[PDB]
């Protein structure tokens, strides 16, 4: 929880040699046959399905994000997450992506097939229109359930801090907004306020854009979508500042050099847009309109084209230094923090009896305890090959070198 690698890596890999105290150890040694030995890590607090707090749920959810990507790789945690991915993890994730995309397809057809008319357009009454009602039913079933799944997980776990915004903090806020808008929409639908379809169409533009969650799990397109929130926040709200230090400048300057109707004048809402047309190509320069100083008006205009090409190239190289490859290593790190979140969120939603059916490792008689009873752990096997230290004959548990 506190982010301390140095003693976390030592406790999780503690191998106490002497015979008197071997029940304190956590990295055992199962068998050996020449240069192949079976290190046998002890899962005792690392993977406890349900009936305990867990070190893996603490590292993924309630840890410190500066060291979180370094602690989820120590000895067993990296293989423990892949063994919880080769199992239930990967398979039950792609069930959700084919279900949520279909949940947005059905939501889309309810927007396109809608007879927008005044009051509630209710009286379905035919073989065509009951598909529109039943689609709206499924729409609200996405509505109330995304509300509950977000909030009941929010206050209880996952620690809604300001630093987890790329570790499913932003999507923690967007799936709330998707459930807000769909509640307001179906309310205004059944009431009678005509603006229901405007409220409905903000759930179209959000939800398909909120389907960008589900690229998490590939690392091909997953780290790509990390750049989507990276560029748009750290570099677009610091370019649109500097770009609007010229658009509140030049545009409020050039229209000052313009006859006040005494095109003529008093269409500044278009005159703001008319300047923007010139910077991308689709301009006319009819805004000249025989003004008072056309020599002055054109050397400010050709200045503004350069400076908005200067800033546009500056945005590009700001996406080279503050952004890319210094960030391309950090997107790899923050992918695994989103990846390990994906396995655990599935594994937290299973019921306990099924969650115990998908355990990792195996129950191993690991040594004679102090009282003389067998020590029955839940160890996890990691095989390893060593060619240099030719003395792999140690406190071996099973003298028969093999997985029977």
């Amino acid at each position: 929880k506190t982010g301390k690698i140095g003693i976390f890596q030592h406790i999780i890999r503690r191998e106490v040699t002497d015979e008197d105290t071997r029940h304190l150890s956590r990295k055992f040694k199962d068998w050996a046959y020449g240069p192949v030995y079976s290190s046998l890590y002890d899962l005792s607090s690392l993977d406890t399905c349900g009936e305990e707090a867990s070190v893996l749920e603490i590292l993924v959810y309630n840890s410190k994000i500066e060291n979180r990507h370094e602690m989820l790789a120590v000895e067993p945690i990296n293989e423990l997450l892949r063994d919880k991915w080769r199992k239930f993890g990967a398979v039950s994730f792609y069930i959700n992506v084919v279900s949520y995309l279909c949940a947005m397809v059905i939501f889309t057809l309810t927007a396109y097939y809608q007879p927008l008319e005044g009051t509630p357009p209710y009286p379905y009454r035919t073989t065509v229109d009951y598909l529109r009602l039943a689609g709206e039913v499924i729409t609200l079933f996405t509505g109330v359930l995304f509300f509950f799944t977000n909030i009941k997980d929010l206050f209880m776990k996952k620690c809604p801090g300001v630093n987890s915004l790329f570790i499913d903090g932003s999507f923690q806020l967007l799936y709330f907004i998707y459930s807000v808008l769909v509640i307001v929409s179906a309310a205004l639908y059944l009431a009678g306020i005509e603006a229901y379809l405007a409220v409905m169409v903000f759930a179209l533009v959000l939800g398909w854009m909120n389907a960008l969650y589900f690229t998490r799990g590939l690392k091909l397109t997953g780290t790509y979508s990390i750049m989507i929130q990276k560029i748009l926040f750290k570099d677009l709200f610091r370019f649109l500042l500097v770009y609007l230090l010229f658009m509140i400048g030049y545009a409020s300057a050039l229209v000052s050099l313009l006859n006040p109707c005494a095109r003529d004048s008093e269409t500044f809402s278009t005159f703001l847009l008319d300047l923007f047309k010139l910077t991308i190509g689709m301009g006319d320069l009819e805004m000249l309109s025989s003004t008072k100083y056309p020599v002055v008006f054109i050397i400010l205009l050709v200045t503004y084209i350069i400076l908005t090409f200067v800033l546009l190239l500056n945005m590009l190289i700001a996406l080279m230094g503050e952004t890319v490859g210094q960030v391309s290593k950090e997107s790899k790190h923050i992918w695994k923090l989103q990846w390990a979140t994906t396995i655990l969120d599935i594994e937290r939603s299973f019921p306990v009896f099924l969650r115990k059916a998908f355990r990792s490792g195996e129950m191993v008689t690991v040594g004679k305890s102090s009282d003389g009873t067998p020590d029955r752990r839940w160890c996890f096997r990691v095989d390893e090959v060593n060619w240099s230290h030719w003395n792999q004959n140690l406190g071996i548990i099973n003298e028969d070198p093999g997985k029977n």
Partner: protein, 189 residues
């Protein structure tokens, strides 16, 4: 898993003695099976050919390899198990299934210089296992490209290549083909 008294002794070592072993050969001299007692393989489907000669070379225990060779165990006993299969075929450690091959694979030269050059039964270096691999094919099998592995493999590949040229001058060992057709060079490519 048809272990006998002698493989059980050779699994459980402590400073490499287990002092039952020379005594248990002496009782085996009085009853008399020794070409069946020392040459009793495990009839398991997981260790199917492993004998007491394999374990004594495994546990790095030369002086108890000398006793089993002097009594003549089964030098060239093939350990045709399922554990002794390659990493693709289910098994963990593939060494070419032979006691000279097991001595050359696990960086163990003094048993290689004893299994081939002894008063008793010799381990000729031209023998093939169940799939064709000789003592030089199996040094290519365990040849992970790390720094320490390539140090003794190239040292033991020559030491078996030279020694076959001395004893058998009419045959280069690196012509003897795997049952896939491969040579020890083509198996490395």
């Amino acid at each position: 898993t048809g272990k006998t008294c002698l493989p059980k002794a050779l699994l459980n070592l402590s400073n490499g003695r287990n002092d039952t072993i020379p005594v248990l050969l002496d009782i085996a001299e009085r009853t008399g099976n020794m070409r069946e007692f020392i040459n009793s393989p495990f009839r398991d489907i997981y260790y199917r050919g492993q004998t007491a000669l394999h374990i004594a070379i495994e546990r790095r225990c030369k002086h108890y390899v000398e006793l089993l060779v002097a009594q003549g165990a089964d030098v060239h006993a093939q350990a045709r198990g399922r554990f002794f299969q390659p990493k693709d075929e289910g098994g963990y450690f593939y060494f070419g299934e032979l006691p000279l091959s097991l001595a050359a694979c696990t960086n163990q030269p003094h048993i290689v210089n004893y299994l081939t050059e002894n008063p008793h039964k010799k381990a000729d270096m031209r023998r093939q296992d169940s799939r064709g691999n000789t003592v030089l094919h199996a040094l290519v099998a365990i040849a992970d490209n790390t720094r320490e592995n390539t140090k003794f493999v190239t040292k033991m590949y020559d030491l078996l290549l030279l020694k076959c040229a001395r004893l058998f001058p009419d045959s280069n060992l690196e012509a003897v083909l795997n049952n896939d057709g491969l040579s020890p060079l083509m198996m490395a490519a």
